[PDB]
Design a protein around this ligand. Structure first.
Ligand SMILES: [Mg+2]
Ligand SMILES: [Mg+2]
Ligand SMILES: [Mg+2]
Ligand SMILES: [Mg+2]
Ligand SMILES: [Mg+2]
Ligand SMILES: [Mg+2]
Ligand SMILES: [Mg+2]
Ligand SMILES: [Mg+2]
Ligand SMILES: [Mg+2]
Ligand SMILES: [Mg+2]
Ligand SMILES: [Mg+2]
Ligand SMILES: [Mg+2]
Ligand SMILES: [Mg+2]
Ligand SMILES: [Mg+2]
Ligand SMILES: [Mg+2]
Ligand SMILES: [Mg+2]
Ligand SMILES: [Mg+2]
Ligand SMILES: [Mg+2]
Ligand SMILES: [Mg+2]
Ligand SMILES: [Mg+2]
Ligand SMILES: [Mg+2]
Ligand SMILES: [Mg+2]
Ligand SMILES: [Mg+2]
Ligand SMILES: [Mg+2]
Ligand SMILES: [Mg+2]
Ligand SMILES: [Mg+2]
Ligand SMILES: [Mg+2]
Ligand SMILES: [Mg+2]
Ligand SMILES: [Mg+2]
Ligand SMILES: [Mg+2]
Ligand SMILES: [Mg+2]
Ligand SMILES: [Mg+2]
Ligand SMILES: [Mg+2]
Ligand SMILES: [Mg+2]
Ligand SMILES: [Mg+2]
Ligand SMILES: [Mg+2]
Ligand SMILES: [Mg+2]
Ligand SMILES: [Mg+2]
Ligand SMILES: [Mg+2]
Ligand SMILES: [Mg+2]
Ligand SMILES: [Mg+2]
Ligand SMILES: [Mg+2]
Ligand SMILES: [Mg+2]
Ligand SMILES: [Mg+2]
Ligand SMILES: [Mg+2]
Ligand SMILES: [Mg+2]
Ligand SMILES: [Mg+2]
Ligand SMILES: [Mg+2]
Lengths: 197, 191, 193, 172, 136
RNA sequence: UUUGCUCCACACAAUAUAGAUGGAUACGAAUAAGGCGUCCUUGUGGCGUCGCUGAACCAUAGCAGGCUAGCAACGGUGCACUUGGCGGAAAGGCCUUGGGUGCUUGCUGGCGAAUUGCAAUGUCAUUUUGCGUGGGGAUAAAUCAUUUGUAUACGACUUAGA
RNA sequence: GCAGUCAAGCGUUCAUAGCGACAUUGCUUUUUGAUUCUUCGAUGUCGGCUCUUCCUAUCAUACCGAAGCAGAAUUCGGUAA
RNA sequence: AGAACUGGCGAUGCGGGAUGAACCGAACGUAGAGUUAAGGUGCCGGAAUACACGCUCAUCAGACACCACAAAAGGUGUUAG
RNA sequence: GGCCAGCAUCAGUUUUGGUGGCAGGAUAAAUCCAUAGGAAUGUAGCUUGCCUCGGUAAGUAUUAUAGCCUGUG
């Protein structure tokens, strides 16, 4: 449907996000995920810090190197979450995950593009108010992720330069509205508006 | 069973105005001002008249309702704390070793410095919170007085001291040494 | 952390230049010859990289090398290395760095009497080494057949694998070690009978 | 057991040489089709009189329809129910629109609140609570206050494309 | 320095609240809330629109900002009388919601020719607007 | 080691393709709350309005889009130039100036289209690459062997040699 | 082999600080049985030495709670390999 | 370990129960269209992130027969009686 | 007529829609209309008490300046 789809992770539930993205891949749709630090997980912080440490101890006894790798960074947690839902060992497996990209923050290109959300994975829409959840930035750093401060730094910076972007944009349409009204009541307007436009 | 609506009444005085966007509460009165973040809750605050503000839960379960009262309570001591104020009093209690207490200061700071507890050669320091102001009471023996605008802050700085004087490796029935909260009240008198 | 640029000094000793090669004598020694141009024009090129660093950069490090030729060694080929610069403010650091291009830094300007300092270095090398001395394992008893500087049991039957934690023969020494808290008892001068 | 109908069922002991015209007993039965309904009738009759379906006959089978299908009625309901460790009688109130919807939710409740499969439940009485304030359960009496209104906070529209270009808004 | 407590102002499920059915037989049809069954179920009635008085799940229906004076548990005909009286239909009709609805309904019923006309037109509007959007 | 290397231009040839076929169309934050407009005392402010899906918005007519005329407008847009800025998270992209030049379906004309036979993806994209031509641009090193011993089972490492 | 529930008792007094009868519910698989499924064209048969790693039902070391904890010493319990 | 009746495995593939001699379903010549069984339909994976009413929040939740275990006894957790 | 297709009319099988006429039943039950009686989650009116000029509140009050419920037709 599109060349590439950018998803503003913030407020998306790890597994449910995983599930849709996975499929979109296999159906031939590229997806680049942003802001995985702001990704949510059901259940409060401690439960998902437990679960993670549970994961931590599984390792090849005779050689901790040649067995399970434990990645920390939110993106790479989200990739584990996702890859486990792709027949990833197959040719078709590697095929799908070539198209996929996961990111902390919003770097070049994608920060100039637009990003979408997945209502069937948005936490606010899905979780019941009352229940507690975890943010992937916090979970990651509390198991040794290294870059919580630097990301938050660069996104503080980003959010300023895009407000500047927005500020000017919204202004220019106040004109474009002001234009689209001096041409209201005109003959072409009524005709158009009589055709549902 | 999900009660379709229960509500509470936070009553307002002549001194204060209290203003709430989303669930960020700001109470400002004579004593200064304080603010609280109720966003963890889901209630609906509704101004009725300058001296009255209802808070409410729609179709809430037992636990939810049960959070209603305590929201009311929480905001209510914000309202009081900014009019009357809070004054937590405490007493040194020692059966041989004169517990000696002082305010010290390293890089702004302000700490409460406890010495010689049970003769310990060690020096204890509890920091003084922002908001709370400690007085060493005159005309009272071994009494210490934490004043200020916020119950939560006063009562915490209070409990910090009193717990930094926990006695170990002796029977704490016989060895009752410590600093203890002996009176909780308000700052402005009469009330 | 990622390196953004690296402004170099204009004139560069043959001591350093030699480090950039594998066959000095055969070579045309063209190292850094076009770079050295960059100064030619007014200054333009350098002062932007320099400027570039200042604008960005959370950390400034300095590229120095040794005067091996003063040392009594035969070595000739000097040692280049980056030293992070911990005085104040990025700009102030790169100013400092630019000021010292082609210029010499003392040792008194770094260490004092009775400073604790750490030492970073590659351990002496011993080569392929048996288990008894590489790992400080028990000598096996005298009577044992087919060798006794060994480990008798290389591991349980299960996991049916030798493990990463049991001792084997192999390279000893030439390991890198960061060794801390050595005190400076004397800082000597060379011009000093 | 499905979406329910309610049936008047009438049966009787098979007529005999010297007892023609046996007595004729009726039960209202909530069941989904009439095949189940007759099964039930015989089921309850055998836990009552000396009869078997073998020695008796159904005389009539008639769907009873809701008298006032779009009148909100308050229902008192009387179940006998079997649990894992013994049996029990119960009384619940249900505020719906027809005995039939009322029995549907009952059976659901019992399933949900008490793990009680269909088999384990006997309906003893379903009756219209005539005068309010003989309504005895709080969870119903809540809905009988005057001028009652309420909001439906945190409203959740259902998306129809995986992706959305806006950010959801639960206002309502 | 008055006190200033936000609000949050929800549409309510109250006798006489008008909903817009979304699922099924009726659907797009308006109807009014007569009596109120439970937290999830109301009794609705929409006689002017054809929708049969019935019990419905609140999740099948979407509450509109419109409301009108209707006695609890009022039968079909009284519904009709109070509805026409309150003139709820003209109110609904005249709102962005109901207007935006017709707007899409029309677009859906264009003709490949009409569509071509919509384009030629959108050209004409574009020419003279972009022109004004460049002169002040 | 038979005139080699590199950037930019075009030419021919191959070789590909995890799968173009109008547009990946940029705040942030909250969701028991928000967006936008406007007002002002500039605030947790007043007032308005919107949602209830992008079912949108923008683009979209012309031999796959030909050859031509005029008019109204001074608008739009493509391309190569040029002026001044901004972007280091992977910036490698964005904005702004000025003349030039093409197109404009904003409007009104002249001409063309068939026979591809009643459909046959009916070929319009973008990857690497090879060979000559000519416009700039540039003129090394590594390895073997020897050699040191801060190194070494052998390789490796570390030195040295116009 | 290890851990419970009930509480008649023990503990100057006082069921449960520390213990616990009569009963009764369990866990464990370093006891020993029971069995005979796998190997009898062969899986080297006791113990020590050596060395790694895991388990916790923790002996010591960290921080606690309890006591028939005055102090000293000890006992019971928690987080804990 | 040993008897009764039937049905199976042994001699038997196929679909389900991830896996598996015996369970569920169904018994096989070579094929095409259709419909189903048992069992399923977030993604791996064909197939509703369907509808509906409740219940449940676990600092060792729970998740489908055979089946891959848990009990006495307790809880002012919460739900209905 | 060799290879392969498209369309049409049909035949066997099968799948998914639109639409027409009928039969049951409490000859559905409802709605609706008629009528009789009623009551409260008591509409109008009335009384009374506070109360920024009528708004509340707590009485009386059964269709009034809303309506509902129940049977019978
Ligand atoms: Mg471990
Ligand atoms: Mg940390
Ligand atoms: Mg103790
Ligand atoms: Mg002691
Ligand atoms: Mg650079
Ligand atoms: Mg040796
Ligand atoms: Mg040793
Ligand atoms: Mg040694
Ligand atoms: Mg040894
Ligand atoms: Mg020997
Ligand atoms: Mg009836
Ligand atoms: Mg009972
Ligand atoms: Mg490919
Ligand atoms: Mg608003
Ligand atoms: Mg605004
Ligand atoms: Mg405002
Ligand atoms: Mg839009
Ligand atoms: Mg053209
Ligand atoms: Mg990239
Ligand atoms: Mg023309
Ligand atoms: Mg006893
Ligand atoms: Mg006692
Ligand atoms: Mg006794
Ligand atoms: Mg044992
Ligand atoms: Mg054996
Ligand atoms: Mg054998
Ligand atoms: Mg063998
Ligand atoms: Mg052998
Ligand atoms: Mg062996
Ligand atoms: Mg032997
Ligand atoms: Mg333990
Ligand atoms: Mg403890
Ligand atoms: Mg005692
Ligand atoms: Mg250990
Ligand atoms: Mg462990
Ligand atoms: Mg069988
Ligand atoms: Mg055999
Ligand atoms: Mg078989
Ligand atoms: Mg199979
Ligand atoms: Mg299984
Ligand atoms: Mg998988
Ligand atoms: Mg699928
Ligand atoms: Mg069972
Ligand atoms: Mg139990
Ligand atoms: Mg063919
Ligand atoms: Mg046919
Ligand atoms: Mg029909
Ligand atoms: Mg009314």
């Amino acid at each position: 449907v599109e060349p590439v789809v950018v998803i503003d992770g913030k407020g998306h539930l790890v597994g449910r996000l995983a599930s849709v993205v996975a499929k979109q891949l296999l159906n031939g749709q590229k997806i680049v995920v942003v802001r995985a630090e702001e990704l949510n997980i059901s259940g409060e912080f401690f439960r998902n810090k437990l679960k993670y440490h549970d994961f931590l101890r599984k390792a090849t006894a005779f050689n901790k190197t040649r067995g399970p790798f434990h990645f920390r960074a939110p993106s790479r947690i989200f990739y584990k979450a996702l890859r486990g839902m792709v027949s990833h060992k197959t040719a078709r497996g590697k095929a799908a995950l070539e198209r996929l990209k996961v990111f902390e923050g919003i770097p070049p290109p994608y920060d100039k593009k637009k990003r979408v959300v997945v209502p069937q994975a948005l936490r606010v829409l899905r979780l019941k108010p009352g229940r507690k959840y975890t943010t992937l930035g916090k979970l990651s750093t509390s198991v040794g992720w290294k870059y919580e401060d630097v990301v938050a730094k660069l996104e503080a910076k980003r959010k300023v330069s895009s407000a500047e972007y927005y500020a000017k944009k919204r202004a220019f349409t106040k004109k474009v509205a002001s234009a689209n009204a001096t041409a209201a009541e005109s003959d072409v307007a009524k005709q158009l508006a009589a055709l549902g436009y | 069973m999900k009660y379709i609506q229960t509500e509470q009444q936070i009553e307002v005085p002549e001194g204060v105005t209290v203003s709430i966007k989303s669930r960020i509460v700001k109470v400002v009165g004579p004593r200064g001002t304080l603010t609280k973040n109720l966003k963890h809750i889901d209630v609906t605050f509704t101004k009725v008249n300058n001296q009255l503000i209802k808070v409410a839960v729609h179709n809430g379960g037992r636990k939810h309702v049960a959070a209603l009262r305590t929201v009311k309570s929480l905001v209510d001591n914000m309202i009081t704390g900014v009019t009357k104020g809070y004054k937590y009093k405490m007493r040194y209690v020692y059966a041989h070793f004169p517990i000696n207490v002082n305010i010290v200061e390293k890089d702004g700071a302000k700490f409460i410095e406890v010495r010689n507890f049970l003769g310990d050669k060690k020096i204890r320091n509890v920091p003084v919170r922002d908001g709370v102001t400690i007085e060493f009471s005159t005309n009272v023996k071994d009494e210490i007085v934490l004043s200020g605008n916020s119950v939560e802050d006063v009562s915490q700085n209070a409990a910090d001291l009193q717990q930094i004087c926990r006695v170990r490796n002796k029977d704490i029935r016989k060895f009752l040494d410590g600093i203890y909260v002996s009176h909780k009240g308000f700052i402005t008198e009469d009330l | 952390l990622r390196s953004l640029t690296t402004v170099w000094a204009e004139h560069l000793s043959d001591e350093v230049k030699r480090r950039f090669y594998k066959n000095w004598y055969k070579s045309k020694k063209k190292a850094f010859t076009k770079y050295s141009a960059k100064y030619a024009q007014d200054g333009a090129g350098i002062e932007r990289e320099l400027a570039r660093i200042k604008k960005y950069a959370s950390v400034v490090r300095v590229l120095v090398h040794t005067q091996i030729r003063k040392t009594p060694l035969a070595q000739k080929k000097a040692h280049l290395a980056e030293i992070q610069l911990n005085g104040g403010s990025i700009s102030e650091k790169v100013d400092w760095a630019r000021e010292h291009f082609e210029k010499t830094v003392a040792v008194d300007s770094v260490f004092e009497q009775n400073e604790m300092i750490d030492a970073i270095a590659v351990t002496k090398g011993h080569g392929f080494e048996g288990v008894t001395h590489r790992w400080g394992t028990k000598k096996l008893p005298r009577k044992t057949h087919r060798g006794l500087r060994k480990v008798a049991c290389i591991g349980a039957w299960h996991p049916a694998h030798v493990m990463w934690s049991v001792a084997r023969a192999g390279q000893r020494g030439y390991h890198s070690r960061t060794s801390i808290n050595h005190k400076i008892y004397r800082v000597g001068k060379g011009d000093d009978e | 057991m499905a979406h329910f109908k309610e049936y008047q069922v009438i049966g009787r002991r098979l007529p005999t040489e010297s007892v023609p015209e046996p007595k004729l007993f009726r039960m209202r039965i909530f069941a989904s089709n009439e095949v189940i309904a007759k099964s039930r009738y015989w089921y309850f009759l055998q836990k009552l009189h000396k009869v078997k379906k073998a020695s008796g006959e159904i005389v009539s089978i008639n769907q009873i329809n809701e008298a006032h299908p779009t009148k909100v009625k308050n229902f008192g309901v009387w179940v006998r129910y079997d649990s894992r460790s013994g049996t029990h009688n119960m009384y619940k109130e249900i505020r719906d629109v027809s005995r039939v919807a009322a029995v549907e939710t009952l059976y659901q409740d019992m399933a949900a609140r008490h793990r009680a499969r269909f088999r384990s439940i006997h309906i003893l009485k379903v009756a219209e609570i005539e005068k309010t304030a003989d309504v005895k359960r709080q969870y119903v009496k809540q809905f009988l206050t005057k001028d009652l209104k309420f909001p439906l906070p945190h409203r959740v529209q259902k998306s129809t494309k995986t992706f959305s270009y806006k950010r959801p808004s639960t206002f309502y | 320095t008055d006190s200033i407590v936000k609000a949050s102002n929800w549409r309510l499920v109250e006798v006489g609240r008008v909903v817009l059915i979304k699922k099924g037989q009726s659907a797009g049809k308006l109807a009014a809330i007569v009596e109120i069954i439970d937290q999830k179920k109301v009794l609705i009635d929409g006689p002017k629109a054809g929708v049969p008085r019935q019990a419905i799940n609140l999740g099948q229906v979407v509450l509109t900002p419109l409301t009108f004076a209707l006695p609890r548990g009022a039968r079909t005909a009284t519904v009709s009388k109070k509805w026409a009286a309150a003139a709820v239909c003209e109110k609904w009709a005249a709102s962005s919601w109901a207007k935006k609805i017709a707007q899409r309904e029309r677009r859906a019923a264009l003709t490949d020719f009409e569509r071509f006309q919509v384009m030629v037109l959108r050209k004409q509007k574009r020419y003279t607007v972009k022109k004004a959007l460049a002169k002040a």
